[PDB]
Structure formats: C-alpha cells, structure tokens
Amino acid sequence: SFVEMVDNLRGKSGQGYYVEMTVGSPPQTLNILVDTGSSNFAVGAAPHPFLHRYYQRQLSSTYRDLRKGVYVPYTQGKWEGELGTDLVSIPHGPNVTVRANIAAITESDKFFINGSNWEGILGLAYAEIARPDDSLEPFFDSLVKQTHVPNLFSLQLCGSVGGSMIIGGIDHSLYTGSLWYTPIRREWYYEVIIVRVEINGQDLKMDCKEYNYDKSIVDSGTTNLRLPKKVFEAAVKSIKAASSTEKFPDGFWLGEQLVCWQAGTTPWNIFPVISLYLMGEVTNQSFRITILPQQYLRPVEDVATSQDDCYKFAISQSSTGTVMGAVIMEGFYVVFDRARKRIGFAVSACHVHDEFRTAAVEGPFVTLDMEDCGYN
Numbered sequence: 001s002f003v004e005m006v007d008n009l010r011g012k013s014g015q016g017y018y019v020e021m022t023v024g025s026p027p028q029t030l031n032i033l034v035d036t037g038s039s040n041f042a043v044g045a046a047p048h049p050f051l052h053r054y055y056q057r058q059l060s061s062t063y064r065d066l067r068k069g070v071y072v073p074y075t076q077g078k079w080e081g082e083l084g085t086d087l088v089s090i091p092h093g094p095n096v097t098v099r100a101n102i103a104a105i106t107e108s109d110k111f112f113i114n115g116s117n118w119e120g121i122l123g124l125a126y127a128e129i130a131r132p133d134d135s136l137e138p139f140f141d142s143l144v145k146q147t148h149v150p151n152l153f154s155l156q157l158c159g160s161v162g163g164s165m166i167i168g169g170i171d172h173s174l175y176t177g178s179l180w181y182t183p184i185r186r187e188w189y190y191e192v193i194i195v196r197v198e199i200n201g202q203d204l205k206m207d208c209k210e211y212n213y214d215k216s217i218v219d220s221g222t223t224n225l226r227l228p229k230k231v232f233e234a235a236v237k238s239i240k241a242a243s244s245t246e247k248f249p250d251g252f253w254l255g256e257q258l259v260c261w262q263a264g265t266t267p268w269n270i271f272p273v274i275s276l277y278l279m280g281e282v283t284n285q286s287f288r289i290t291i292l293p294q295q296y297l298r299p300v301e302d303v304a305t306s307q308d309d310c311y312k313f314a315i316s317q318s319s320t321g322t323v324m325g326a327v328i329m330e331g332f333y334v335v336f337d338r339a340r341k342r343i344g345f346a347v348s349a350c351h352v353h354d355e356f357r358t359a360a361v362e363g364p365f366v367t368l369d370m371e372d373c374g375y376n
C-alpha cells in the first residue's frame with residue numbers, strides 16, 4: 001500500500017522537503033518539514049510574517065496542554081513554545097491517527113523561511129536528542145507504539161522539487177540496483193561512520209577519524225554537505241585544482257557568491273565526483289556512494305534579468321562534524337531502518353543525470369580497521 005505515499009513530498013530548492021499533515025479535531029492542515037536531523041515535532045501556533053496558516057489549539061477539541069515550555073536551538077534557527085498533545089494524521093501516508101507530542105511555537109528567531117510553504121517541522125531522529133529532554137516521545141516512536149506501522153521509513157528526495165517519504169517500509173519501484181547498508185552507530189542523531197573519501201578517484205588520505213570529527217550524521221533538514229574544517233579544506237583544495245581551468249571568486253567557495261554560465265554551457269566536466277565510503281554490515285567491508293557536481297552545485301534563480309544558469313557551492317565547513325544533507329541524499333533512496341539499526345542507500349529512480357558520469361552506490365569494498373574511524 002506504499003503507492004499512496006509515493007510523491008508525497010514537495011519543496012523549493014534550498015528550503016527543505018515537506019509533507020502534508022493534519023493536527024487536531026477537526027483536522028487542521030499544515031505542511032511540515034521532514035527533518036532526520038532533529039527529534040521534535042513542532043508547528044507554528046501564533047501569527048508570523050512568514051506563516052500563511054498555523055495551529056490553533058483553541059479550535060481543537062482533542063488538544064491537551066502539557067503545561068510545560070520547550071525550546072529548540074538548531075545550528076542557525078531557533079524557536080520556543082508550549083508542549084501539548086493532539087491527534088495527528090498524514091493524508092498521503094499510513095491510514096492511521098496517533099496522539100503525538102506537539103510543540104506549539106509561540107516565538108521564533110530565523111526558524112521560518114520566507115516562501116518555503118511549510119509551517120512546522122517533523123523531527124524523525126531519536127528521543128536522545130529531543131528537547132527539553134529524552135522523555136518527550138518523538139512522533140515516529142508514538143506512531144510505531146500506537147499502530148502496527150513497522151519501525152522504519154525511507155526517503156526519496158528528488159532534485160520546484162518533489163520526493164517520497166515511505167512510512168513503514170521500502171517501495172521497490174523507487175530505486176534501482178542493490179541497497180547498501182551502513183550501521184547506525186548510536187541512536188541519537190542518525191549517526192554513521194565514514195571510512196574513506198575520494199575525489200575523482202584520488203584518496204584524500206587523511207586519518208579517517210577526521211571524517212567523523214566529532215560525528216557524522218544523515219540530516220534531511222540541512223541543505224549542504226557539511227564537512228569538518230580540516231576535511232573541508234582538503235576537499236576545496238582538490239576541487240579547486242580539478243576546476244582550475246576556470247577561476248572563481250573566493251566567496252564562491254565560501255557559499256557566499258554564486259557563479260553563472262550561459263544557459264546550457266555549465267562546464268560539469270571540470271568539477272570532480274566525490275565518493276564517500278561508509279562502514280558496511282560485515283567485517284572489514286564498506287561501500288561507497290558517489291556524488292556528482294550536479295548535486296553539490298545547487299541551482300539558484302538568476303540574480304539578474306538574464307537567463308543564465310547560476311549555482312551556489314553546496315559544500316560548506318562545519319564545527320560539529322560531517323553533515324550529509326539534502327544534496328547528498330538527493331538522487332539516492334535512503335532507508336532509515338530503525339528496526340535493524342541501519343541506514344540503506346540505493347540509486348534513486350529520480351537519480352541525477354550526467355553525460356559521461358553517474359551517481360552510484362557500489363560495493364563491496366574491503367576496508368581494514370573501520371572501527372578506528374569513529375571519534376571518541
């Protein structure tokens with residue numbers, strides 16, 4: 001019955017992917033950001049310049065106040081509000097209704113995005129990182145506990161954008177080839193271990209601990225691939241060298257300035273492919289996913305009146321570990337198999353196209369001492 005969830009996501013480039021949900025009785029409709037990088041379900045519940053609608057608790061007969069406050073500070077944005085529970089459904093999802101914790105957002109600072117078309121956030125990660133603390137049961141935990149929905153979901157994020165969130169399973173029509181699984185190292189974020197990095201087939205040759213300093217996570221709520229300082233520097237250097245045929249503004253590599261070319265003349269060939277090797281399921285075994293420049297050069301609307309193709313560099317520096325964001329997940333089908341504590345990757349049905357190259361998930365590879373790549 002997964003076909004009813006195919007294509008249930010929409011979004012705008014750089015502004016996340018959202019799914020339709022209803023809260024309360026009678027049902028109030030809201031679009032909700034899909035975020036594997038957090039664990040709170042929260043919705044606008046007071047007027048805001050960027051909100052066209054919001055959760056009105058007074059109009060819901062099934063609303064219950066938990067008489068406790070809550071705030072969540074993300075890397076950039078933050079909000080605060082009041083905890084409660086209500087009934088929640090996903091129209092293009094499983095045919096169930098659950099009573100879930102809901103944070104009613106009453107104040108926010110750079111959380112809501114102008115024109116994003118979503119009014120709330122669905123944190124799909126584990127209770128360990130829920131605010132105010134891990135006693136606030138996350139939505140998916142409530143869903144599994146209260147229904148017969150299997151304990152897993154999958155995300156097909158496609159490159160004005162669309163995709164699928166399959167709740168409770170895997171839809172085999174959404175990917176090609178084999179699924180490759182990497183262990184979830186710890187159940188807080190969706191934390192994984194990267195064991196090797198190559199750019200155009202050349203090993204970066206860093207201590208693999210550097211790749212996961214101080215963690216590596218899969219985060220649909222983040223746009224970019226974000227890399228620890230040392231890794232970011234090595235990668236930009238390598239990517240500069242590969243594209244040195246053309247010179248770019250120093251602010252381009254910082255994600256500040258965008259670069260444009262005549263429509264249809266974008267020199268994809270001069271930008272390298274990036275391979276991330278992930279810890280596999282058996283001893284000394286890994287697999288790789290390969291990322292094309294069509295993923296890490298994010299398309300942005302022309303700043304001028306002209307119709308050129310302009311892009312932003314969607315790889316940026318992190319101080320909190322590697323973040324495999326939307327531009328990594330795009331073109332892959334990603335299975336969050338909570339039941340078996342693993343994350344699967346396969347080439348998506350909406351995979352990224354290049355003339356002479358292709359995004360791939362490939363294995364098996366042999367990699368010794370993968371345990372040493374984890375940071376402690």
Ligand SMILES: CC(C)(C)c1cccc(CN[C@H]2C[S@](=O)C[C@@H](Cc3cc(F)c(N)c(OC(C(F)(F)F)C(F)(F)F)c3)[C@@H]2O)c1
Pocket residue numbers: 014015016017033035037038039072073074075076077078110111112113116129130219220221222223
């Ligand atoms: C929540 C806790 C566990 C405390 C936490 C703290 C720090 C880092 C993390 C890791 N995950 C974070 C990384 S970043 O802050 C985006 C965030 C979700 C989020 C919060 C926001 F405000 C906005 N605007 C948002 O919209 C993005 C954006 F690109 F920014 F427009 C869009 F693309 F989705 F639209 C997305 C993730 O959740 C978790």
